[PDB]
Amino acid sequence: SKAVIVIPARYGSSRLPGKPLLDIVGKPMIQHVYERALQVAGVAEVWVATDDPRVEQAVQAFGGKAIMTRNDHESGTDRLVEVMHKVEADIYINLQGDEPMIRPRDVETLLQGMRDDPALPVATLCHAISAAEAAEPSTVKVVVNTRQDALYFSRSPIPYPRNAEKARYLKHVGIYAYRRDVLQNYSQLPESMPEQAESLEQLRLMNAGINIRTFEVAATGPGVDTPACLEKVRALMAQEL
Amino acid sequence: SKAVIVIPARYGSSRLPGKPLLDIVGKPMIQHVYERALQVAGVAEVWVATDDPRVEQAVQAFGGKAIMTRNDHESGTDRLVEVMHKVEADIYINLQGDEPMIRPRDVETLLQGMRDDPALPVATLCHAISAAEAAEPSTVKVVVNTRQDALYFSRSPIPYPRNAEKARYLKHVGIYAYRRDVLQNYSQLPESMPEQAESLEQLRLMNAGINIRTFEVAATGPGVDTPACLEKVRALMAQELA
Numbered sequence: 353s354k355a356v357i358v359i360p361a362r363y364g365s366s367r368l369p370g371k372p373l374l375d376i377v378g379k380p381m382i383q384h385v386y387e388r389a390l391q392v393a394g395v396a397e398v399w400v401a402t403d404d405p406r407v408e409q410a411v412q413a414f415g416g417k418a419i420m421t422r423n424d425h426e427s428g429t430d431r432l433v434e435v436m437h438k439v440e441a442d443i444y445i446n447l448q449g450d451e452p453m454i455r456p457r458d459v460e461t462l463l464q465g466m467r468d469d470p471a472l473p474v475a476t477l478c479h480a481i482s483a484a485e486a487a488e489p490s491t492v493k494v495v496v497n498t499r500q501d502a503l504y505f506s507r508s509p510i511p512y513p514r515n516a517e518k519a520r521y522l523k524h525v526g527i528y529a530y531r532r533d534v535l536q537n538y539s540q541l542p543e544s545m546p547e548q549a550e551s552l553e554q555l556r557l558m559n560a561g562i563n564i565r566t567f568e569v570a571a572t573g574p575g576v577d578t579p580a581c582l583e584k585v586r587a588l589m590a591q592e593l
Numbered sequence: 594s595k596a597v598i599v600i601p602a603r604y605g606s607s608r609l610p611g612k613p614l615l616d617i618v619g620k621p622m623i624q625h626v627y628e629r630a631l632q633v634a635g636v637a638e639v640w641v642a643t644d645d646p647r648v649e650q651a652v653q654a655f656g657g658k659a660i661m662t663r664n665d666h667e668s669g670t671d672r673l674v675e676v677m678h679k680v681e682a683d684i685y686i687n688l689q690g691d692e693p694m695i696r697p698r699d700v701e702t703l704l705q706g707m708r709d710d711p712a713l714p715v716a717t718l719c720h721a722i723s724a725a726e727a728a729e730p731s732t733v734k735v736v737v738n739t740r741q742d743a744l745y746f747s748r749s750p751i752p753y754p755r756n757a758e759k760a761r762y763l764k765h766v767g768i769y770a771y772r773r774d775v776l777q778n779y780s781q782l783p784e785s786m787p788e789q790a791e792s793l794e795q796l797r798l799m800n801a802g803i804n805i806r807t808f809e810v811a812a813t814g815p816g817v818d819t820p821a822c823l824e825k826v827r828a829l830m831a832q833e834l835a
């Protein structure tokens with residue numbers, strides 16, 4: 353069972369142009385994600401899928417591996433599909449390029465989940481959050497069954513607190529592990545109403561009946577979408593030293 | 594394929610003490626639900642399940658079949674399990690005792706779905722609603738996939754309207770059809786945190802990986818839960834006789 357990591361890292365960004373190259377305590381963000389991907393055991397290759405020559409140069413300068421991809425993809429998943437046709441693997445792990453506080457051990461948990469059950473199509477992560485936190489539509493909630501399969505991904509606070517002291521909440525951590533066959537059939541899947549209404553691409557998978565198993569991990573460090581959040585990651589990663 | 598209908602009828606009610614006996618055009622609500630259940634084709638027997646002798650006498654007075662069940666039951670579905678041990682059937686249909694405007698044709702659609710797919714564990718009903726109607730916690734919402742299977746049920750307005758113009762809402766009609774094996778171990782299913790927080794019995798099935806297929810029907814008549822709606826129901830019900 354060959355497994356590879358692919359890190360979507362487009363140069364463009366609405367809030368932080370050239371995000372991948374932003375310096376964090378001495379190293380460009382994309383490097384922090386790449387080096388940590390390298391600490392994950394059981395993975396044969398780690399790639400940074402980019403669209404700009406500057407990102408590609410930056411990745412090669414610190415020893416990393418980069419692969420150029422179409423500069424008109426609508427999302428990291430669509431770019432991952434392009435990489436799939438080019439890099440042969442049985443399992444592909446999609447790691448966000450703007451989440452440098454990722455924990456290698458967390459990615460191992462994810463991989464183990466795929467290998468312990470070869471029938472599992474997709475796997476992802478999640479961690480506990482308060483009800484106050486679950487109220488934010490910017491934070492995605494996931495509801496799971498006993499086997500930990502996802503029932504639904506929503507920006508609405510679910511489960512609903514009819515009996516609030518009985519409610520337990522979960523934030524979805526955007527890391528994904530995919531079986532090869534799922535990426536091969538991907539471009540054929542139609543966008544679904546829940547997906548367009550919620551603005552949650554993973555819903556496209558649930559629509560088509562493809563199962564996604566979650567795996568709980570401890571609370572995860574913040575991502576880099578805003579200048580404010582960027583200073584947050586710096587202060588955090590620095591002190592971590 | 595033997596199919597039977599069981600109508601749970603707990604007496605108590607915070608808002609409407611004794612809903613089942615509440616009169617509607619000269620018939621206890623429970624009668625309207627029973628007579629309509631009798632119009633459903635393909636069903637061999639129709640029972641009413643209660644924990645209160647007052648409801649029991651009321652059903653026998655109009656010549657219906659009534660069975661007494663424990664009072665410690667947590668839900669209607671748990672109550673049907675007790676009935677299951679005594680009343681044999683391949684398929685059990687749980688019809689709410691407080692929705693008198695039920696359409697026999699909709700229950701047949703439900704039964705047809707079970708028979709068309711002998712592998713389907715549970716089937717239920719749903720119908721389109723406005724976003725405004727979906728805001729109410731008392732109205733349960735359901736979100737499905739392309740095979741009409743349910744993804745999740747909630748009192749919360751789902752799907753969340755990030756792009757409000759693309760949100761389409763489906764209201765869950767609380768009628769259920771289950772294979773016998775579903776009930777035989779429904780009361781032995783692990784606790785569902787979602788069930789406990791949302792107070793939705795069907796969530797115990799999802800928590801256990803048991804599939805529930807949805808079937809869309811036309812907008813249904815309101816229910817007798819609030820003194821406000823109870824009047825809308827009498828007006829309509831009487832208007833129907835006309």
Ligand SMILES: Nc1ccn([C@@H]2O[C@H](COP(=O)(O)O[C@@]3(C(=O)O)C[C@@H](O)[C@@H](O)[C@@H]([C@H](O)CO)O3)[C@@H](O)[C@H]2O)c(=O)n1
Pocket residue numbers: 601602603666667668669670672688689690691731732733746765766767768792793794795
């Ligand atoms: N301990 C209990 C509680 C309820 N019931 C009976 O079960 C039926 C369904 O209950 P409901 O409370 O009116 O309806 C609910 C509700 O909460 O509105 C139950 C809930 O678990 C779930 O089945 C939703 C559906 O999602 C449809 O809304 O519907 C009623 O005839 C009620 O008397 C019972 O027998 N024993």
Ligand SMILES: Nc1ccn([C@@H]2O[C@H](COP(=O)(O)O)[C@@H](O)[C@H]2O)c(=O)n1
Pocket residue numbers: 359360361362363365425426427428431448449450577
């Ligand atoms: N069109 C797109 C959109 C996002 N992505 C990647 O997906 C991740 C998260 O997306 P955001 O730009 O929205 O933060 C980033 O690593 C980003 O580079 C991509 O490679 N192509």
Ligand SMILES: [Mg+2]
Pocket residue numbers: 450575576577
């Ligand atoms: Mg982002």
Ligand SMILES: [Mg+2]
Pocket residue numbers: 689691692767816818
């Ligand atoms: Mg009701």
